[PDB]
Amino acid sequence: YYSMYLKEIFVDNFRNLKKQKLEFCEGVNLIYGLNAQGKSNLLEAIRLLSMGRSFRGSKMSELVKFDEEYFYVRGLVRSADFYEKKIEFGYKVNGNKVIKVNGNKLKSTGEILGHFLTVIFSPEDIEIIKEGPSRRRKYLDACISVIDKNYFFDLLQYNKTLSNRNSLLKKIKEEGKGEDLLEIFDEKLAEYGARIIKVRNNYLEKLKNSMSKFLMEISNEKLEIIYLNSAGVKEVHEENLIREKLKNRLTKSLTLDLKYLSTQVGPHREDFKILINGYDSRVYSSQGQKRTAALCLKLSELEILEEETGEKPVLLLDDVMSELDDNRKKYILKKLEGFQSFITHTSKSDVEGDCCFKIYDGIVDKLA
Amino acid sequence: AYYSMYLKEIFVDNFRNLKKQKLEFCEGVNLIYGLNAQGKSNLLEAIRLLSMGRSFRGSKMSELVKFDEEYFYVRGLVRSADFYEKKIEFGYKVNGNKVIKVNGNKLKSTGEILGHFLTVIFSPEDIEIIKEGPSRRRKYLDACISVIDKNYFFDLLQYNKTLSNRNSLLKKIKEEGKGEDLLEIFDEKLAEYGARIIKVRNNYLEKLKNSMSKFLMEISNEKLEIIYLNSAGVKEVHEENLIREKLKNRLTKSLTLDLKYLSTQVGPHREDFKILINGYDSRVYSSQGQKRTAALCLKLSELEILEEETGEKPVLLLDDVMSELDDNRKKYILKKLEGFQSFITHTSKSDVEGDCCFKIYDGIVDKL
Ligand SMILES: Nc1ncnc2c1ncn2[C@@H]1O[C@H](COP(=O)(O)OP(=O)(O)OP(=O)(O)O)[C@@H](O)[C@H]1O
Ligand SMILES: Nc1ncnc2c1ncn2[C@@H]1O[C@H](COP(=O)(O)OP(=O)(O)OP(=O)(O)O)[C@@H](O)[C@H]1O
Ligand SMILES: [Mg+2]
Ligand SMILES: [Mg+2]
């Protein structure tokens, strides 16, 4: 076995939170407080060790406590083949992200991906159903990159090239009516986009299969995922084929690209649709049935993460115990066995955690 | 004591999942209840359509049409302070034809429906006003004001019309030459309208500030302040004579920017107002329930202001706002609802048991 595990966390100058070191027990860490406390703030610091950014999309500026110049998070983690691993996040108001794993500072922020695995269940996950393709596309990358460093690299390269190619368009439109030498980037974008498309396709087939079963078991509704990729393909097939399609679309779209100084073809503007019972759930569905869609989305994220990486993530549940009754809660609890849980709530006298913490002014306090 | 706004009956034909029917409601608390995805919000949406001329959810007209149909039609009979029974009729055929009639008479422009039937709608998706972009806020401010202020709503139409006008001149200046002369006037026009909007917007925001504080004070004890980032940088001013120049002013300085982006950059279509809670911008730093509180307050204040500037007393649409309560506020605000017509959606018949209650299933509403 040997599942993941946040042994302890130390946070200095982090958001609301006073400077403190907290030790956690594996299983369910109930955390209760009241809107000026830092429940979500703790959960944030924890995921920061996992992704190296805020799950609430916040600037690393705002993580820094009011009127300070820096903040520091340290965490002690057990992987499956790691008895103990130290992850360190430090930021100063200079603009210096510093990230050490076992004393060894990391080259780029992205290398923090993988060392500590979390799945964060936020009620704001509902936005992946509701917002535009940008929100869904980001989410998609985040799911894959935590599983596949290859995909991550390709993304980064892809964007660099895209950004270069955009500059080159600017100069072409204005300073010289013709560069064919735009050809070299088109070729590069096509070659990278195709690998990106081919991997996204691979993830989404899994999400189809996985979410379908959840969506079916939960509410008897038929799930369907439609990947709106840049190749314009219904089935995905050969990476080579995608490469040739992307390149062509890139040639035929030049004019539009010169009108806008943007690149219209490419995985930087794909999207997937989530059809519940044949209809777009972004356009046609009940609040409650968007909620359910988002829930199965998260379930599948987790299920796939265990499947692909042999590890069992640390589950963070922020403000979900609210929307539930009593037998529906211990039901959920029972599904959380093999996992270390960090669960925020608002009452202690309700859900019985393997150890729990009251939090009042930014100070965590065990067994209360 | 004037007669409250009161919705006697509604007829819906081909409106979302809702069957063809005519329902008759109570002066008082109409409790609409049912399982989810049955049509409670749809129904609430049809109501507010009569009040607002569009979907409160932002959906587009074509999507309101029942699936695989050619039109939809809604009829309301309302009692205002000066009316015993007013007909408001709304129809849309999927050829894009919008048709509104009040008491038989087809209205000239859709906007003219504003003010006849007065509703205030409270949904959980009100949080978004606190924590999305300047779009969401600017727009909700426009909606709030235009309902009370027929005049402003005309100002606004005329602003966006010559704004769009101006931006098409920009695509004929740095693209095709000349255009210099004709440019002079638009700036005067944009500045004339703009300053109307600004004075009025400021008016409402001062009222918003005052009312909201009083609420936010009573409810969570936090201190509210409100900053109106007007387009004329004239923080803390009140005389339209001068704001016209500043806009005419800033509109010249930003000429080359304007030309670079082919958009206009200075005016009230780029404004926003910040909702500070205890000194801190709540877009950025507020908690979650800290926004649930900020939202409810925003709404409460809307209702309050609305009552006192129209001399009416709106219908209250309470969309799925009652799941998340404690019975010490659920049996409370029920008392607060007394003088008004409430539509309250829920999923349980058991005690939110107001003055009347219908049960909806499969788009059909029966009365117990
Ligand atoms: N940089 C910061 N410095 C200090 N406090 C901050 C900072 N950013 C956010 N906060 C504060 O954190 C406080 C509450 O923390 P958090 O954001 O975790 O809410 P919460 O206690 O989890 O409550 P809820 O149940 O409402 O989610 C808020 O009052 C907010 O102003
Ligand atoms: N144009 C349409 N034609 C047919 N059905 C639609 C249309 N638009 C939305 N629906 C469907 O209406 C059903 C219910 O809509 P609505 O949002 O009113 O559900 P709801 O009753 O609000 O859910 P809840 O019961 O949680 O309030 C959903 O299944 C939705 O997919
Ligand atoms: Mg929270
Ligand atoms: Mg709904």
Residue numbers in the entry:
A (entry chain B): -2 to 365
B (entry chain A): -3 to 364
What text appears in the publication on this structure?
RecF is a multifunctional protein involved in recombinant DNA repair, homologous genetic recombination, and DNA replication. Similar to RecR and RecO, RecF is a recombination mediator protein (RMP) in the RecFOR pathway for ssDNA gap repair. RecF contains the conserved Walker A motif, Walker B motif and signature motif of ABC-ATPase that exhibits ATP-dependent dimerization; additionally, the signature motif residues interact with the ATP bound to the opposite molecule. To gain insight into the mechanism of ABC-ATPase RecF, we solved the crystal structures of TTERecF, TTERecF-ATP, and TTERecF-ATPɤS.
We determined the crystal structure of the TTERecF-ATP complex at 3.0 Å through molecular replacement by using TTERecF monomer as a model. For each stabilized dimer, ATP acted as a fastener that linked domain I of one monomer and domain II of the other monomer and was located between RecF molecules directly opposite to each other. The contact surface area between the two molecules of the dimer was 5863 Å2, which was 17.8% of the total dimer surface area (32919 Å2). Two ATP molecules were buried in the positively charged tunnel of the RecF dimer interface. ATP interacted with the Walker A motif of one TTERecF and with the conserved signature motif of the other TTERecF. Mg2+ in the active site binded to ATP β- and ɤ-phosphate O’s and two H2O molecules.
